[PDB]
């Protein structure tokens with residue numbers, strides 16, 4: 001697995017989302033697109049907007065096709081309306097190919113475009129099933145596979161920094177790698193463990209057990225996937241179902257009790273600060289999620305450090321002071337494994353073998369005493385009961 005050409009093709013190391021460069025139309029209009037495995041719609045800005053440095057101009061593409069049909073897409077945070085149509089797409093730092101894909105020209109949007117993010121579109125990599133209007137709208141990756149020889153899987157390495165990067169730093173620095181059609185062994189260390197995609201709509205998985213510094217949260221596993229558990233590059237936080245969230249924060253609060261933090265912090269609202277270089281990483285617990293394996297009654301665990309769940313935010317008063325935000329939050333829509341998780345590993349979306357694999361990221365942030373981890377197997381039974389129906 002050597003796609004050294006696609007290696008380092010991502011951006012927004014310490015920004016608002018990881019994007020890849022793409023081009024749409026003829027002649028090629030360049031646009032940075034947010035990699036989002038939590039949805040299935042390919043959409044781009046198509047009209048000027050305040051937080052848009054550039055956008056898709058249909059009238060200038062010789063290959064554009066207006067489907068004369070509107071589309072509406074609502075996300076946990078933000079939404080947009082647009083006009084459906086198709087055009088030719090390319091990924092400069094992806095496989096050398098061109099495919100005709102469905103494209104939503106965003107005309108009306110609300111709390112979607114993040115000012116300064118530097119991305120003008122979104123690449124929904126999930127399955128047709130959750131695509132809008134309905135599943136008849138072939139998602140991008142599906143078009144890519146049907147129209148070429150590119151293998152049916154992709155890999156993601158999202159690189160966090162551990163420290164805040166200013167405007168020009170997020171621009172001139174690798175944010176990670178999105179390997180389309182294969183795996184690059186250089187992106188990870190150790191072994192790759194695969195968990196089954198329960199059902200092909202979101203990239204759904206099943207969590208069988210959660211630990212806070214080795215201590216079992218000991219709750220009925222169904223709770224851990226209450227509604228569902230998905231993997232989403234487009235979500236910042238490790239989002240957890242209300243009940244699981246309350247329990248985790250209680251345990252995290254107990255593990256770090258030698259220091260007190262204002263309630264707002266645990267809500268992810270107010271940031272906590274320490275003298276530059278004095279962040280007490282050791283007082284915070286590591287967090288482990290156990291996922292079902294391909295082998296029956298067997299499972300493995302992925303473990304993250306506070307360096308993954310304590311996000312670096314630039315302090316108002318420039319003070320060298322290192323500041324963070326608790327990036328573990330509540331969800332009424334199931335567990336969401338966002339960047340907090342993905343930034344710790346190399347994740348393989350083996351759509352072809354209907355599975356997702358994890359391995360310690362060659363770029364995850366850590367200290368000299370602890371590191372992210374992926375280990376197995378563990379003999380736990382009746383794990384089918386974990387799934388929500």
Ligand SMILES: CC(C)C[C@H](NC(=O)c1cc(C(=O)N[C@H](C)c2ccccc2)cc(N(C)S(C)(=O)=O)c1)[C@@H](O)C[C@@H](C)C(=O)N[C@H](C(=O)NC(C)C)C(C)C
Pocket residue numbers: 015016017018034036037038039040073074075076077078079112114122130131132232233234235236237238239329338339
């Ligand atoms: C571009 C997004 C607008 C896409 C959706 N992102 C969200 O909604 C969302 C984005 C961010 C956020 O800051 N991300 C940045 C870019 C980011 C991402 C990664 C690293 C750094 C920064 C935070 C949250 N918070 C909850 S947080 C505070 O992290 O706890 C949520 C999608 O990735 C989510 C996805 C699950 C869905 O909404 N899918 C749709 C869906 O089911 N909709 C139902 C109907 C609500 C789809 C299938 C139709």
